[PDB]
């Protein structure tokens, strides 16, 4: 009947932005030097219309030792470390970076971007010439919508460093968890077409960084699938993902539809936008949420999708 694997397929008319993994695959064909140059140029152009937020103090304490090593290196040595990261080389810095959470790696590169601008780290060489393929990948990124662009950039960062699979057993380094926003101060979401209390609780608890309440919405074996990734299965792993990767999001759902399927279960699709704390309101990612709920309104499965275009925000099929 329903398994996690079959639940992945609900609302199959939902068109996701698979140009993100497509573009990443093209990017991964390029030399390390062209990868760095390409991201430099893309980030420079993006900055003209989107506004990145500075990393917090606790984010940066974990990257500090590595950044100070870099601050001291020659321009040549600095470039070599950056190429090592892009190449996923086996070096001490690449092994250190492999155990950092997503947001720590992002803060590392945001500091390097500042330093490269303002003189401290080796710039991209003046008159650098991208390969023909790299020039085309950069143009492809320019034509993506902002939500797709920042997803490509983040993925490129997350994939650098030594393969964490190749490390064995290892302590993942992550920020302290923010406290749940006071109940009184929360702003509840509204969703046109949906009043299911679990769906509203999922949105509101995530918006409040209240992961202990969020996780109780799931079945013990319930799964969550982030954009372009495999399902994270079971409360233990979902709860860790929440606390590690999901703080300070702003979910802005707009509309949804609900459909009874077999055995008192119910499949629900919501569309809307999401803001990441890295860009705030300057980037609104067009998202769908696809939930499979038990008769007791528990989340058996939820998939979160980055949508191919804004048209898909209105794609809400009520009968299958």
Ligand X SMILES: CC1=C(/C=C/C(C)=C/C=C/C(C)=C/C=C/C=C(C)/C=C/C=C(C)/C=C/C2=C(C)C(=O)CCC2(C)C)C(C)(C)CCC1=O
- CA distance readout (Å), 154 to 106, 206, 289: 7, 21, 21
Which residues, including other chains, have CB under 8 Å from residue 87's CB and lie 6 or more apart? Answer: 32
Q: How far is the CB of 279 from ligand X (least distance, A)?
A: 7
Tokens of 266: 């119910």
Q: How far is the CB of 278 from ligand X (least distance, A)?
A: 4
- CA distance readout (Å), 95 to 10, 114, 306: 39, 23, 30
- Site map for ligand X, 112-151, x if CB under 6 A? xx--x---------------------------------xx
Contact residue for ligand X among 20, 36, 98, 288 (CB under 6 A): 36
3 state DSSP class of 247: coil
Closest CA to 150 of 63, 45, 76: 45
The yes or no reply on residue 274 touching ligand X (CB under 6 A) is yes
Closest CA to 245 of 222, 230, 226: 226
Contact residue for ligand X among 11, 27, 100, 109 (CB under 6 A): 109
- CA distance readout (Å), 205 to 100, 225, 250, 286, 298: 26, 18, 11, 20, 15
- Whole-number Å distance between alpha carbons of 31 and 37: 10
Contact residue for ligand X among 120, 249, 252, 313 (CB under 6 A): 249
Residue among 257 and 307 whose Cβ is closer to ligand X: 307
The piece of 8-16, 125-133, 153-161, 291-299 that touches ligand X (CB under 6 A) is 153-161
The yes or no reply on residue 304 touching ligand X (CB under 6 A) is yes
Residue among 46 and 316 whose Cβ is closer to ligand X: 46
Q: How far is the CB of 229 from ligand X (least distance, A)?
A: 9
- CA distance readout (Å), 127 to 1, 30, 113, 130, 233: 59, 18, 18, 10, 48
The yes or no reply on residue 246 touching ligand X (CB under 6 A) is yes
Residue among 289 and 300 whose Cβ is closer to ligand X: 289
Q: Provide the strand spans (E) within the chain.
A: 218-225, 232-233, 250-260, 266-275, 285-293, 299-306
The yes or no reply on residue 291 touching ligand X (CB under 6 A) is no
The piece of 91-99, 136-144, 215-223, 270-278 that touches ligand X (CB under 6 A) is 270-278
Residues 175-234 that bind ligand X (CB under 6 A): 206, 226-227
The yes or no reply on residue 62 touching ligand X (CB under 6 A) is no
- Whole-number Å distance between alpha carbons of 98 and 43: 23
Closest CA to 70 of 4, 114, 14, 133: 114
Q: How far is the CB of 46 from ligand X (least distance, A)?
A: 9
Residue among 202 and 257 whose Cβ is closer to ligand X: 202
Residues near ligand X, by CB under 6 A: 36, 39-40, 43, 52, 106, 109-110, 112-113, 116, 150-151, 153-154, 157, 206, 226-227, 245-246, 249, 251, 274, 276, 278, 285, 287, 289, 304
């Amino acid at each position: 009947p329903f398994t996690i694997d079959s639940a992945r397929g609900i609302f199959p008319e939902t068109l996701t932005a698979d140009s993100v993994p497509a573009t990443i695959a093209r990017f991964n064909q390029l030399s390390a030097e062209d990868q760095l140059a390409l991201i430099w140029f893309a980030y420079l152009e993006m900055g003209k219309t989107i506004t990145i937020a500075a990393p917090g103090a606790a984010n940066m304490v974990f990257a500090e030792n590595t950044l100070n090593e870099l601050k001291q290196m020659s321009f040549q040595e600095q470039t070599q470390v950056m190429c090592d990261l892009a190449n996923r080389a086996d070096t001490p810095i690449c092994r250190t970076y492999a155990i950092w959470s997503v947001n720590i790696k992002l803060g590392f590169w945001y500091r390097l971007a500042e330093w490269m601008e303002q003189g401290i780290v080796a710039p991209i060489p003046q008159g650098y010439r991208l390969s023909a393929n790299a020039a085309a990948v950069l143009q492809a990124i320019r034509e993506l919508d902002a939500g797709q662009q920042i997803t490509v950039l983040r993925n490129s960062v997350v994939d650098m460093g030594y393969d964490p699979s190749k490390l064995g057993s290892y302590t993942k380094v992550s920020e302290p968890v923010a406290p749940p926003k006071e109940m009184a101060k929360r702003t509840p979401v509204t969703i046109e077409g949906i009043d299911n209390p679990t769906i509203l609780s999922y949105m509101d608890n995530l918006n409040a960084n209240d992961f202990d309440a969020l996780i109780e919405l799931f079945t013990p074996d319930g799964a969550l699938q982030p954009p372009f990734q495999k399902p994270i299965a079971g409360k233990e792993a979902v709860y860790r993902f929440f606390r590690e990767d999901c703080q300070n999001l702003k979910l802005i759902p707009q509309r949804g539809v609900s459909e009874a399927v077999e055995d008192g279960y119910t499949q629900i699709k919501v569309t809307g936008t999401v803001q990441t704390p890295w860009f705030g309101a300057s980037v609104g990612m067009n998202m769908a949420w696809r939930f499979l709920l038990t008769p007791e309104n528990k989340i058996f499965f939820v998939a979160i999708d980055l949508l191919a275009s804004p048209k898909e925000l209105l794609n809400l099929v009520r009968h299958h």
